[PDB]
Amino acid sequence: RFKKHVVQHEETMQAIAQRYYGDVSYWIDLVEHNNLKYPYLVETDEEKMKDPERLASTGDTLIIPIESDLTDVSAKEINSRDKDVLVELALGRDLNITADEKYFNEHGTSDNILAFSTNGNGDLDTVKGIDNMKQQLQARLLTPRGSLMLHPNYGSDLHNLFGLNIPEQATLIEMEVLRTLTSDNRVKSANLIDWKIQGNVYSGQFSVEIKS
């Protein structure tokens, strides 16, 4: 895992390692992760134009490992070249099945609702990054608790919670949604920020803390 950062005006590479990891001494290993040539951070972009991929300048992103992966040579090699592909790999890659986004939001808690799609040309669509995490939360919420053919106790009792719209039913629904969202270890916490009623319609929203 890693933290994101950006190059500030005339910040030296010594200064970053000292602020995040404490000891300045660690900058030496920290430059290999960002694959930098000797002018590790340089102010001017027309100087980055010298050989763009092997440098960082003012306004560019940087990668900051956690201290345990700082010394790992494999983490060094991977972070050297992958660069922005970090987030995608770290959140993982999967087949996209939100083909009919307008449609699956008309019949949730019913089956047969999702389907493969095609993007690009001649290849099934795929999803990655934060979109993948959303899609997976979405599918997990719209699936009943014991309906996947292996590893059951997956999904929700959202199909079971339909009731007289009195507030206790609404707190129950809130708690089920929060449990469902907090099931995945990748997510830190969820919390409600609004619940709202319109006769026979529930509405509400939840904030979820995704790890960096």
Binding site: D45, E46, K48, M49, D51, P52, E53, R54, R81, D84, G120, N121
Partner: protein, 139 residues
């Protein structure tokens, strides 16, 4: 030697009418692929300032993705994210040839070894290699 340099190439932009102001072109501007099948994207490392009255300007754009995958055929880059009224269309006359992929030290050393070994002459194995160099020579 190859050092995984990301693909880059000259690109030209056109406008409806000659300009009457020094338009700004920020660094980090994205030139998205017009073709749906091509997910490739490109970014502009350095700022450019359009002239007061020039009807056309050529700039250098670097790809986001390294490797051979960054190569694109001619006549693919025809969209700009930071669009404007004055901007008409974009095109790249010359194809992106600077796509580069980096191999391991062994792959770098093996060609050198093969070249040095090939300089041997007046021996059975060297005669055999030199015969096999010409096509239609086997066994």
């Amino acid at each position: 030697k190859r050092q995984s340099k990301r693909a880059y190439g000259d690109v030209t932009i056109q406008f409806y009418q000659p300009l009457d102001m020094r338009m700004y072109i920020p660094a980090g501007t994205t030139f998205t692929s017009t073709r749906q099948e091509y997910p490739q994207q490109f970014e502009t490392l350095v700022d450019y300032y359009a002239e007061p009255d020039s009807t056309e300007i050529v700039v250098e754009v670097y790809c986001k993705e390294t490797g051979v995958a960054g190569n694109v055929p001619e006549g693919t880059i025809n969209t700009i994210a930071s669009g404007s009224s004055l901007i008409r269309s974009v095109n790249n006359e010359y194809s992106f040839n600077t796509g580069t992929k980096e191999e391991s030290q062994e792959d770098f050393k093996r060609r050198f070894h093969s070249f040095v070994e090939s300089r041997g002459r007046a021996t059975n194995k060297s005669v055999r290699y030199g015969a096999l160099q010409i096509p239609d020579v086997e066994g």
